[PDB]
């Protein structure tokens, strides 16, 4: 379906290039922000302010087709129920980077 084509665009992720890969989360703001107080793990980059959600979450992987091309960005929409990993920073202690989904 077209969910990804729309989302990437309305969230300005297709402005000056086509962001190849992007994950969206279909949970409450409160639920996502809560991960910041869940399972502390290492970030992909070596830092240690990342957290893995205790629960899987309803997400959606957006990945540009091999045939896509700016300014006509095109994505395959893939839905999933998976644990997310985010880097939390600041006060309030909230997500500032999406690290991974497992």
């Amino acid at each position: 379906s077209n969910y990804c084509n729309q989302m990437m665009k309305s969230r300005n992720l297709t402005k000056d290039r086509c962001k190849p890969v992007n994950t969206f989360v279909h949970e409450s703001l409160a639920d996502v922000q809560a991960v910041c107080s869940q399972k502390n793990v290492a970030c992909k980059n070596g830092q240690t302010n990342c957290y893995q959600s205790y629960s899987t979450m309803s997400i959606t992987d957006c990945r540009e087709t091999g045939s896509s091309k700016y300014p006509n960005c095109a994505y395959k929409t893939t839905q999933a129920n998976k644990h997310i990993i985010v880097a939390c920073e600041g006060n309030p202690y909230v997500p500032v980077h999406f690290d991974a989904s497992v």
Partner: peptide, 14 residues
């Protein structure tokens, strides 16, 4: 734009 605000624009679809 803040890092937090960017996270939402990019990954938040509640």
């Amino acid at each position: 734009e803040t890092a937090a605000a960017k996270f939402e624009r990019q990954h938040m679809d509640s």
